[PDB]
Design a protein around this ligand. Structure first.
Ligand SMILES: CNc1nc2c(CC[C@H]3O[C@@H](OC)[C@@H]4OC(C)(C)O[C@@H]43)c3nc(N)[nH]c(=O)c3cc2[nH]1
Ligand SMILES: CNc1nc2c(CC[C@H]3O[C@@H](OC)[C@@H]4OC(C)(C)O[C@@H]43)c3nc(N)[nH]c(=O)c3cc2[nH]1
Ligand SMILES: [Zn+2]
Ligand SMILES: [Zn+2]
Lengths: 365, 364
């Protein structure tokens, strides 16, 4: 049968790689974009907001309903985060210590807590295939003192995540665990986090603490030295990235996995991604543009709907407009990953990145 | 249960409270009718006919069991006719006496709306209350533009009546509402009302409002338009509205409401409270341990504080807007219940004064 977790590289070019991740529920073609999973009403894997799901409707409720695969109507692999991002983005509502993170008690007495052990337990109840270690996304900007103490605490939490993950045979035999590298924008702290994660051992290694307002120039600079610190024979996950040009540049620096809310956030805010850069469909230039959102896109929206139709739908307050924008953006992101995977296999990825950026920045939509 | 039976239990001024009895349940009036969604306290929900015929299509919904199966909702459902999209999407339409033809899509598909096709689609959706195919006259409109538009809509209202009665299954189990037009002009409103009464309908909706006219102008049109409709029939104000808009509209004879603001506000960081709307994104709520509203009985206010929702939206968690949306919908139903209670008690005039006094002071 299919293996638990097997990462093989089929072709390389520079620091970029293309290949597959084999799991019991399907194959993940890398470099991969992993869209946000939703409740049931082309991607290889979807994600679940662990913090969101544990509050609504609850990890135990999800488990009794059959798991996220039953909850989201998705039989392919699923990855869940650990909540370490919400440890930072919601720090004002948290009491934090070495044991874990305790959130402010609710008006009904209910109180939620996150720890390396509880996070893995929740991710097991959700039935996810790829588990993220409980970490802390260090805020940006952060002093070298604040970044060091946070990264060091996160590495202590990473070891407890490893132990808690291995404490369940059912989870350790069917799922995979990813360590998350921290260190903010500092090379030395990044090397300490990578060394700590490798000594513990993980099926995959994620680069955390980025996509928090640092800018692409700073993000690329951190990727330049951070990704070579991770085990080459293991997949590399850049959390929170990103824009199409962010993804292309990140693949050029050794990243194999991506997640981002921009396709949905842009689709709900009137922005569509095209090969000629992003477009604001609300602009009057599209009032009578009879072309689809993107001339090359093969998604269902571009085969039927014009820019003019979508422009007037959003102007008229029809939520169908944002759904088509969202539907296009998600499919466009998968088409970007496919073109990236193709170009690495052909040995023409460096040419693709140049041609992509040239046309994506000219904005000749 | 009867097909459609509207009875008034208590009156005060032009305001009324009562029930609408249908084969699938009872609708307590004055009623707010939230926007129905696909399955994942209101008496009736609505379905965007124009949206549903495009996604996933009226025929697909019919084969799935109808909107009651589609939305997991066994209670009554009301569907609009598309007459609003005739105006809001007029740039993509070719309009004539026969109906409205939308611009052909990139796959050759073309959609058309007419009094006959609209009623057929609403039958395919399996809705319990059908709206006549009309045209929401744009605002502002010249008296010439409003007259031709209203008269066209009344010819469409008659064809809607005939098409509705052409199906025994629909005519014996559903209801048809006529829609009054005339923009902001009294004489044109009287012609539309007279025309709709000569045709005959189970209910009468006040259309062509909530299109940017302002509350003062909207109330002024309601002052003379609602008394033109049959008193023994329900009155539906389409698109209204804000909480104070609803209270003022009930004061002028409206029994039914629909509005996207509870969802539009919940997604844009605005929550409705008895002390007026609040912008949860303001820093004053960063540590406000109180719920969104002190009196609200919804699930969100029993568990979540203003501080928690404020930080969720600030952190980009979509759960924040869901709680805001859930509260706004439940708050709207609590407003209708308090209105229905006060009419039954004979103290509605006092409620309207007390509501506006506290709602506009903004002492949240
Ligand atoms: C956007 N920038 C960005 N995302 C990051 C994440 C993922 C956190 C997001 O995963 C989403 O669910 C799948 C949730 O939806 C939003 C609201 C986007 O937040 C959650 C991170 N996760 C962990 N564990 N650790 C990190 O250092 C980290 C850094 C990030 N930077
Ligand atoms: C907000 N103001 C407003 N709404 C009105 C409507 C309902 C049309 C809306 O009903 C909603 O679905 C249930 C949809 O939400 C949006 C997207 C707002 O549009 C649909 C009207 N409908 C008809 N048939 N005729 C009218 O004269 C009319 C006037 C309106 N003024
Ligand atoms: Zn597309
Ligand atoms: Zn509430």
């Amino acid at each position: 049968d299919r293996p638990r977790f097997s990462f093989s590289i089929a072709a390389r070019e520079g620091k970029a790689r293309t290949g597959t991740i084999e799991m019991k529920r399907g194959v993940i073609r890398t470099p991969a974009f992993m869209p946000v999973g939703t409740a049931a009403t082309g991607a290889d894997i979807i994600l679940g907001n662990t913090y969101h799901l544990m509050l609504r409707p609850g990890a135990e409720r999800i488990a009794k309903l059959g798991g996220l695969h039953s909850f989201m109507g998705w039989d392919r692999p699923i990855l869940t985060d650990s909540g370490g991002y919400q440890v930072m983005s919601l720090s004002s509502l948290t009491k934090q210590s070495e044991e874990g993170v305790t959130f402010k008690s609710h008006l009904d007495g209910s109180r939620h807590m996150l720890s390396p052990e509880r996070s893995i337990e929740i991710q097991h109840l959700l039935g996810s295939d790829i588990v993220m270690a409980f970490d802390e996304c260090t805020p940006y900007p952060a002093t070298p003192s604040r970044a060091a103490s946070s990264m060091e605490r996160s590495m202590r939490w990473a070891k407890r995540s490893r132990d808690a993950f291995d404490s369940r045979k059912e989870q350790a035999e069917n799922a995979a665990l990813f360590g998350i590298q921290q260190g903010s924008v500092f090379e030395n702290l990044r090397q300490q986090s990578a060394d700590a994660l490798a000594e513990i051992g993980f099926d995959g290694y994620a680069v955390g603490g980025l996509a928090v307002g640092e800018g692409q120039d700073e993000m690329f600079r951190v990727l330049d030295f951070s990704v070579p610190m991770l085990p080459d024979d293991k997949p590399h996950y850049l959390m929170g990235v990103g824009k199409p040009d962010d993804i292309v540049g990140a693949v050029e620096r050794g990243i194999d996995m991506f997640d981002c809310v921009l396709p949905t956030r842009s689709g709900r805010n009137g922005q569509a991604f095209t090969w000629d850069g992003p477009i604001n469909i609300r602009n009057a230039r599209f009032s009578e543009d009879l072309k689809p959102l993107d001339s090359e896109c093969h998604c269902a929206v571009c085969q039927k709907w014009s820019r003019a139709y979508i422009h007037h739908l959003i102007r008229a307050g029809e939520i169908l407009g944002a759904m088509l924008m969202t539907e296009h953006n998600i499919a466009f992101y998968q088409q970007l990953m496919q073109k990236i995977r193709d170009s690495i296999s052909e040995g023409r990825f460096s040419q693709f990145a140049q041609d992509f950026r040239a046309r994506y920045f000219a904005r000749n939509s």
